[PDB]
Amino acid sequence: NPMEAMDPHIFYFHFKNLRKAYGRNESWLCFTMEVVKHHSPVSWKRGVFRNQRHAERCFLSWFADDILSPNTNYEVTWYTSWSPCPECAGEVAEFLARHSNVNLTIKTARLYYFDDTDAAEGLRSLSQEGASVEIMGYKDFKYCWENFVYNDDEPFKPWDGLDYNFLDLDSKLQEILE
Ligand SMILES: [Zn+2]
């Protein structure tokens, strides 16, 4: 179901942190995962998810059906193009509350297009369930380029406005969470 990496043009298009930019009708989810008991990690998995159900649900389906074992722990990290929608966000926090051997860190390139108060709550329900929510910065984009993109060993070229858009996004995110 999931992919290993994505085409460089899909990365630069869906992961540009232009807070308000339509054309991104899909939601992409880069993930990395560490499976571990009570010592060091005994395995790991990374990959990419696209919308085809949202990309969030395509993860939880694949994850539960193929990976989740009751006597093992999971350190999951998400890099999403759009921040998770209210419906998926609630279904993740419900998963998080029932599965304590899973910890999630969500980094998003963007929040939402409109100021939906609905969406700010799902982002809060997530945080209340122990999940870590943050806005992707230069280092996160750089990390996704090197790990989830067929980059052909080309450097990550940051776009104009990266830091400025992240700054406006991290501001709005912090107000949501507190
Ligand atoms: Zn969603």
Swiss-Prot record:
Changing C88S: Reduced but not abolished antiviral activity. Nearly abolished antiviral activity. Widely expressed. Highly expressed in ovary. Keywords: Antiviral defense, Cytoplasm, Disulfide bond, Host-virus interaction, Hydrolase, Immunity, Innate immunity, Isopeptide bond, Metal-binding, Repeat, Ubl conjugation, Zinc. It comes from the Eukaryota. The active site is at E56 (proton donor). Zn(2+) 2 binds at H54, C85, C88. (Microbial infection) Following infection by HIV-1, ubiquitinated by a cullin-5-RING E3 ubiquitin-protein ligase complex (ECS complex) hijacked by the HIV-1 Vif protein, leading to its degradation. Its main location: cytoplasm. GO terms for cellular component: apolipoprotein B mRNA editing enzyme complex; cytoplasm; nucleus; P-body; ribonucleoprotein complex. Changing E94K: Abolished interaction with HIV-1 Vif protein. Resistant to HIV-1 Vif and reduces Vif binding but is still efficiently incorporated into the virion. GO terms for biological process: base conversion or substitution editing; clearance of foreign intracellular DNA; cytidine to uridine editing; defense response to virus; DNA cytosine deamination; innate immune response; negative regulation of single stranded viral RNA replication via double stranded DNA intermediate; negative regulation of viral genome replication. Disulfide bonds join C85-C88. The keyword Ubl conjugation applies. Belongs to the cytidine and deoxycytidylate deaminase family. DNA deaminase (cytidine deaminase) which acts as an inhibitor of retrovirus replication and retrotransposon mobility via deaminase-dependent and -independent mechanisms. Exhibits antiviral activity against viruse such as HIV-1 or HIV-2. After the penetration of retroviral nucleocapsids into target cells of infection and the initiation of reverse transcription, it can induce the conversion of cytosine to uracil in the minus-sense single-strand viral DNA, leading to G-to-A hypermutations in the subsequent plus-strand viral DNA. This is DNA dC->dU-editing enzyme APOBEC-3F. The gene is APOBEC3F.
